[PDB]
Amino acid sequence: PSRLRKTRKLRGHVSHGHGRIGKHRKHPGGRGNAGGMHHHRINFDKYHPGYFGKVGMRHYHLKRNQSFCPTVNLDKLWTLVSEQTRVNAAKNKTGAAPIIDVVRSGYYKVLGKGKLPKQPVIVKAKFFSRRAEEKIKGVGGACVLVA
Amino acid sequence: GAYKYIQELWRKKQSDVMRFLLRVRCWQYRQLSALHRAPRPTRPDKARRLGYKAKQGYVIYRIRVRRGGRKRPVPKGATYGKPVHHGVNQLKFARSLQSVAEERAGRHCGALRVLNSYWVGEDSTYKFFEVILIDPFHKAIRRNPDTQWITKPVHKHREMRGLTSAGRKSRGLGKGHKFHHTIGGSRRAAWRRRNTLQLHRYR
Amino acid sequence: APSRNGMILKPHFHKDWQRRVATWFNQPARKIRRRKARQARARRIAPRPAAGPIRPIVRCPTVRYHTKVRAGRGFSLEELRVAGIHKKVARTIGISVDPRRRNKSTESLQANVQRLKEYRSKLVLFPRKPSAPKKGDSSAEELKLATQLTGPVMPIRNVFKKEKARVITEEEKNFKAFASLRMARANARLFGIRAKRAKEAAEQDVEKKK
Amino acid sequence: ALRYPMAVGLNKGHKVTKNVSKPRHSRRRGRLTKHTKFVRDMIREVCGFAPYERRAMELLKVSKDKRALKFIKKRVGTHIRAKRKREELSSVLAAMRKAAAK
RNA sequence: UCAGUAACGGCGAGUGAACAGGGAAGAGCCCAGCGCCGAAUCCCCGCCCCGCGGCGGGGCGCGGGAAAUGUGGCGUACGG
RNA sequence: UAGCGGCCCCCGGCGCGCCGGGCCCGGGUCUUCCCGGAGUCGGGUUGCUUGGGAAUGCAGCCCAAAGCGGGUGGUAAACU
RNA sequence: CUAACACGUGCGCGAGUCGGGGGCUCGCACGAAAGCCGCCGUGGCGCAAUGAAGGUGAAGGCCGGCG
Numbered sequence: 001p002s003r004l005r006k007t008r009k010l011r012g013h014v015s016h017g018h019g020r021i022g023k024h025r026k027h028p029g030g031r032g033n034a035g036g037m038h039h040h041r042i043n044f045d046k047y048h049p050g051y052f053g054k055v056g057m058r059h060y061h062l063k064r065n066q067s068f069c070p071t072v073n074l075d076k077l078w079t080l081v082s083e084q085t086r087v088n089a090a091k092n093k094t095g096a097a098p099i100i101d102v103v104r105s106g107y108y109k110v111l112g113k114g115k116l117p118k119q120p121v122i123v124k125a126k127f128f129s130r131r132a133e134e135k136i137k138g139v140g141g142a143c144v145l146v147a
Numbered sequence: 148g149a150y151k152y153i154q155e156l157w158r159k160k161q162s163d164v165m166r167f168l169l170r171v172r173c174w175q176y177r178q179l180s181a182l183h184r185a186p187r188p189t190r191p192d193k194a195r196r197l198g199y200k201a202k203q204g205y206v207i208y209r210i211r212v213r214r215g216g217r218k219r220p221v222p223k224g225a226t227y228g229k230p231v232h233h234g235v236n237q238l239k240f241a242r243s244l245q246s247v248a249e250e251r252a253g254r255h256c257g258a259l260r261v262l263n264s265y266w267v268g269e270d271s272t273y274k275f276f277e278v279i280l281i282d283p284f285h286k287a288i289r290r291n292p293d294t295q296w297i298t299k300p301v302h303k304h305r306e307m308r309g310l311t312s313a314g315r316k317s318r319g320l321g322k323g324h325k326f327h328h329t330i331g332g333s334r335r336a337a338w339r340r341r342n343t344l345q346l347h348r349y350r
Numbered sequence: 351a352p353s354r355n356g357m358i359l360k361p362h363f364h365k366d367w368q369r370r371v372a373t374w375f376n377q378p379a380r381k382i383r384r385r386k387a388r389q390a391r392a393r394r395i396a397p398r399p400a401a402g403p404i405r406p407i408v409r410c411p412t413v414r415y416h417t418k419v420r421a422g423r424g425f426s427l428e429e430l431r432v433a434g435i436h437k438k439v440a441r442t443i444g445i446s447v448d449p450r451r452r453n454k455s456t457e458s459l460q461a462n463v464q465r466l467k468e469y470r471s472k473l474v475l476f477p478r479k480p481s482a483p484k485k486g487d488s489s490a491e492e493l494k495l496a497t498q499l500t501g502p503v504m505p506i507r508n509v510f511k512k513e514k515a516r517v518i519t520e521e522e523k524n525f526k527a528f529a530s531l532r533m534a535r536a537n538a539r540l541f542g543i544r545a546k547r548a549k550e551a552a553e554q555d556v557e558k559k560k
Numbered sequence: 561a562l563r564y565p566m567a568v569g570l571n572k573g574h575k576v577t578k579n580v581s582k583p584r585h586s587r588r589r590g591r592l593t594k595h596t597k598f599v600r601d602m603i604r605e606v607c608g609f610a611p612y613e614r615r616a617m618e619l620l621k622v623s624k625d626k627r628a629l630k631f632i633k634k635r636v637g638t639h640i641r642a643k644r645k646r647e648e649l650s651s652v653l654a655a656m657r658k659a660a661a662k
Numbered sequence: 663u664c665a666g667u668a669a670c671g672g673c674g675a676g677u678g679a680a681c682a683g684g685g686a687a688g689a690g691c692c693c694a695g696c697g698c699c700g701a702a703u704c705c706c707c708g709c710c711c712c713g714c715g716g717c718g719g720g721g722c723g724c725g726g727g728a729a730a731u732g733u734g735g736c737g738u739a740c741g742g
Numbered sequence: 743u744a745g746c747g748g749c750c751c752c753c754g755g756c757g758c759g760c761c762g763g764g765c766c767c768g769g770g771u772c773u774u775c776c777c778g779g780a781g782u783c784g785g786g787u788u789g790c791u792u793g794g795g796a797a798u799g800c801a802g803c804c805c806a807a808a809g810c811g812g813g814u815g816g817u818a819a820a821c822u
Numbered sequence: 823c824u825a826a827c828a829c830g831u832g833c834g835c836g837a838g839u840c841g842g843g844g845g846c847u848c849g850c851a852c853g854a855a856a857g858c859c860g861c862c863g864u865g866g867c868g869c870a871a872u873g874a875a876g877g878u879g880a881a882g883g884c885c886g887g888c889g
């Protein structure tokens with residue numbers, strides 16, 4: 001609202017909060033990002049290093065869909081299925097292990113970060129990591145690849 | 148039929164037979180005037196292919212267009228401005244000579260509708276095109292269900308709006324990754340759609 | 351001029367953007383008009399489905415979405431022929447048909463055939479002449495219960511199959527999935543060069559023997 | 561052992577049976593028909609050969625094969641078209657030589 | 663929405679799409695050619711009958727013309 | 743003003759019936775035949791244009807096709 | 823005034839959050855509002871970073887079993 005803005009409190013002060021020595025002129029330093037290498041060089045180097053120059057290869061017809069690969073972590077791994085699944089597996093005595101499919105829930109690669117509760121799991125995914133594999137093996141379980 | 152033979156003949160333009168013919172015709176056409184009605188198609192097969200039918204209401208005009216490019220119409224040089232726009236005599240027109248010929252025929256015959264056109268000969272300084280026109284108010288076409296589309300008012304001056312086969316080629320119309328400039332109606336439409344702000348009601 | 355600290359910005363307002371501005375003040379009126387046209391067409395086609403022709407099952411054509419199932423443009427001729435539907439009669443009895451789509455697999459073809467057979471079993475066909483029915487027609491008593499249905503006909507569902515919890519055997523507990531992926535990548539990368547090396551080794555051995 | 565389908569490798573991809581079918585009739589275009597061959601050979605017989613074609617035929621007759629290929633490529637365009645044209649001209653020369661001998 | 667992204671740019675200032683995905687809407691078709699049908703096709707003038715304020719339908723004309731340098735029916739890549 | 747309020751006039755659209763006119767029409771299997779658009783594609787160069795980068799698109803000039811061919815598969819080239 | 827960004831503040835929900843586009847609501851004084859969608863969360867931002875790229879991708883500490 002215009003009621004609460006600084007302009008209302010600024011009426012009557014000739015200057016309008018912009019100084020008498022240096023006025024409020026149009027474009028004292030140039031428009032936009034001008035002088036990035038000449039008279040704004042200090043600011044550009046101090047606050048945006050690496051701005052100027054080229055690096056890396058050019059990929060012309062990039063399609064993000066080819067590289068689409070969402071990831072999940074082992075601490076979140078048990079949240080894909082319902083709690084009743086996990087508790088039933090926990091108090092089960094036959095040794096059967098529930099099957100968790102991350103592709104069904106929309107994940108492609110499993111990365112092993114969190115601690116895993118001690119019960120067998122059949123994790124089926126598209127890609128695995130070495131540490132996630134070893135975590136699943138240590139907790140007791142199976143890793144299954146799907147396409 | 149004989150058409151297939153004719154077509155395969157005309158594809159052999161470097162053969163001595165066709166070369167001699169083309170020479171003789173080109174001489175005759177150059178001797179004639181710049182725009183005149185031909186009694187009958189020179190290429191019956193090509194007229195057939197493009198849509199001509201040997202019935203009343205179909206007329207054919209043979210026309211010649213001066214060859215070459217397009218030099219900038221500026222007083223001496225004097226294309227005042229930055230050096231990037233200093234070019235005078237190496238520029239090229241955006242439309243083809245076939246399209247220019249069709250538009251000239253359509254302008255001269257304002258009561259007819261342009262259907263298509265084809266190449267019949269050329270030389271160093273001229274190109275010769277025969278263009279098919281249709282009289283839209285002749286009963287022979289107004290009573291024929293499949294050709295009465297051209298009698299609609301929407302199809303006035305197709306060559307002037309770039310709707311004929313020759314005119315369309317210059318618009319960059321197509322499907323696929325080669326023709327992204329004309330997604331939508333045309334270049335105008337694509338540029339408009341890409342260069343407006345969609346200031347929604349809520350934002 | 352840059353202030354103390356912040357982001358470098360590239361606003362795309364260096365053209366005459368104020369002349370080409372699309373305000374949306376007609377959005378509610380547009381919605382009202384589209385609705386009215388929708389109900390007008392629904393009334394126009396009296397017993398027919400409001401949504402339109404049934405459509406087929408298709409898989410999204412990308413690694414990002416190939417797990418999902420869409421509604422396609424139309425049934426293809428292979429599916430129509432194996433379901434016993436004429437390509438010309440399908441359109442007039444309510445089946446969307448396109449001739450561009452192929453059929454690389456068999457599961458999708460069989461699924462769409464099942465869909466078409468279910469649609470034939472479900473639709474009610476009115477007499478071509480209201481007085482005298484014909485052989486390929488529906489009897490009179492169920493015509494009294496013919497009504498429009500809202501939404502797409504037989505809507506598409508993404509159904510996920512559970513298998514029950516299994517018991518582990520030692521056979522799949524010794525499977526080195528990460529190692530398998532790494533060697534698969536290596537073999538795919540080095541397949542061609544290995545073939546060329548084998549070829550030149552073979553020709554060198556032949557030369558040495560000869 | 562275990563052979564799980566994988567997203568990578570030589571046999572990457574979800575497994576599915578692939579059904580054989582008659583190829584689309586659109587793929588048939590360009591196939592040479594007996595009547596079309598008859599027409600084209602009649603037209604060739606009445607017309608003759610282009611000047612560049614006969615120059616290349618002279619080059620092949622004097623057996624400068626690389627020169628013929630380079631000249632045809634320059635005169636016509638792509639290397640594939642050049643190779644096809646050279647093969648057809650060599651076939652024509654062989655037929656002419658056989659007819660002259662017999 | 664992808665996306666101020668892939669990319670272009672004294673690679674500086676700046677410029678800059680598309681595919682996929684969700685929706686609004688949704689509708690498909692016709693020639694030339696290749697062939698088969700006694701040109702089986704079309705326009706116009708005269709007379710008779712109908713209504714004619716969007717000049718049409720039927721019949722009779724040893725009436726005229728177009729058209730074989732190709733009109734009409736079947737038929738077009740989904741095959742015929 | 744409100745009202746699935748009233749009265750009168752005119753035009754339309756949907757159904758029904760009558761006369762006249764045209765129309766003789768489809769599906770499956772087997773056998774035999776047939777099937778395509780040229781100064782166009784494409785190449786070189788020049789100029790403009792594009793995010794399109796050893797040339798996205800357009801145009802002028804020169805060269806200029808093929809039929810298991812031709813186009814596309816976002817880095818030029820040969821083989822596959 | 824519009825757009826972008828940064829930071830500070832107030833409110834709702836919270837590892838989630840957000841219908842802005844569309845649709846359903848006998849369209850219509852207000853109402854062009856408001857309500858609803860949940861198998862309309864497509865999608866955006868966040869939940870993972872790093873490398874030019876191929877790619878890889880986030881603890882471990884004690885005893886019995888061959889210091």
Ligand SMILES: [Mg+2]
Pocket residue numbers: 013
């Ligand atoms: Mg003061």
Ligand SMILES: [Mg+2]
Pocket residue numbers: 022023028
């Ligand atoms: Mg100052």
Ligand SMILES: [Mg+2]
Pocket residue numbers: 021022
């Ligand atoms: Mg000072």
Ligand SMILES: [Mg+2]
Pocket residue numbers: 025026
């Ligand atoms: Mg200022």
Ligand SMILES: [Mg+2]
Pocket residue numbers: 241
């Ligand atoms: Mg221009």
Ligand SMILES: [Mg+2]
Pocket residue numbers: 316
């Ligand atoms: Mg072209």
Ligand SMILES: [Mg+2]
Pocket residue numbers: none
């Ligand atoms: Mg300052």
Ligand SMILES: [Mg+2]
Pocket residue numbers: none
């Ligand atoms: Mg973003």
Ligand SMILES: [Mg+2]
Pocket residue numbers: 674
């Ligand atoms: Mg610089």
Ligand SMILES: [Mg+2]
Pocket residue numbers: none
């Ligand atoms: Mg620009």
Ligand SMILES: [Mg+2]
Pocket residue numbers: none
């Ligand atoms: Mg899309």
Ligand SMILES: [Mg+2]
Pocket residue numbers: none
């Ligand atoms: Mg819809």
Ligand SMILES: [Mg+2]
Pocket residue numbers: none
């Ligand atoms: Mg014909």
Ligand SMILES: [Mg+2]
Pocket residue numbers: none
């Ligand atoms: Mg430019």
Ligand SMILES: [Mg+2]
Pocket residue numbers: none
């Ligand atoms: Mg490449």
Ligand SMILES: [Mg+2]
Pocket residue numbers: 353354355356828
């Ligand atoms: Mg600041």
